[PDB]
Symmetry: D2
Subunit: 125 residues, 4 copies
């Protein structure tokens, strides 16, 4: 199994009130659903990603990332967000991320296609 397979698997909440439900596979797979508290989004969206299943043992975090395309049976916001970050274990486990949200645009509007931000996920709240 992945070193932090058990630590990552479960339900996570970020500072916006969004909910990230993920299962970590022994190989490095991440699968689950994402529910955003903000934006052009309703209910759950499929997510898939990857994590380092054998991280360093020197106190470093565990690198990971995942993607949501903002289309489900209710809405399509013609956009995708990728979160890139690291999982930090301990009494107050966290996933610290930065993210890129690209919207499909015309070529004329490509310069304003991508938002950047940062989300911190915790196991409570």
């Amino acid at each position: 199994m992945g070193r932090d397979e058990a630590g990552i698997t479960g339900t996570w909440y970020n500072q916006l009130g969004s909910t990230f439900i993920v299962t970590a596979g022994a190989d490095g797979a991440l699968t689950g659903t994402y529910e955003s508290a903000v934006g052009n989004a309703e209910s759950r969206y499929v997510l898939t990603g990857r994590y380092d299943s054998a991280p360093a043992t020197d106190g470093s975090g565990t690198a990971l990332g995942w993607t949501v395309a903002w289309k489900n049976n209710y809405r399509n916001a013609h956009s995708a967000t990728t979160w890139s970050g690291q999982y930090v274990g301990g009494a107050e486990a966290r996933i610290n991320t930065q993210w890129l949200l690209t919207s499909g645009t015309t070529e004329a509007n490509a310069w304003k296609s991508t938002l950047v931000g940062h989300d911190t996920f915790t196991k409570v709240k």
Copy 2:
């Protein structure tokens, strides 16, 4: 099937000489392998992502993203890259991306954990 399922599926090359091999699913899934021409990487790595399988019909691109965790049977660079961008069809199809590469770090080094960059993928070269 996804509107650009056929357009996205296949082999892609970026400006660094890296190779991105992907299969787009009818639902929005992306699966494949990534081979980086630079960095602490050798051979192919698993990737997984998502794309908008029903994009706008007004000339906008198709939003997508995917993740590579840089661990395979040869190396582990304790890091993950996510690419966020859009697919643009036509005679010269392109996937235009920006990316975030997060390395697992100690808490003291978290401020320098994440590189940002941009890759353009084409079907030739």
Copy 3:
């Protein structure tokens, strides 16, 4: 004078323990010094930037940005950081930023030239 000229001018501290000393001009100028608690840096470095001297009056923040080139009389880290963000007034005034740190590189290493991160500045601590 700028609407938040008085609110921005002064000494600010971020979550790393760095110190940002700035004077806002009536026109939109920002001038001052930056002292980083981390990285290849010692003592104060010149900074210069710009802010919106007539922001919206609807409760929106005040957009601003500034640059430090990491050369002073003690060290040269061959790099520059730009912070882009917004000033938020009130009892707990804050400057919320994201930043890009580019190092001079060879062309072969340009893909790993730029770190991205986020700093929050407060008037205390």
Copy 4:
């Protein structure tokens, strides 16, 4: 004088057709005007920044950054862009940048306050 003071000073054009007019000071100062071909912008805006006035001599680029607040006598877009990048000399001199465009927002909209992108500047076109 700065090692690339003469190389940086002058008029630069990016891929959008915007015009960047800058003077590099011997100390590391950058001053000038920016005219954007896209967005909520008309005519010239003040810019100020910093560059490494004594870069490495090993073939590395020269790190630099600058800021524009998008207010002038014609318009105010309540936003600021910072470009962070490096100057590369030679027959085809370039300034390769990534940028962050933050708009003043309410706290509820802060998650969508910042665009990210990349501009390449050349001395022709």
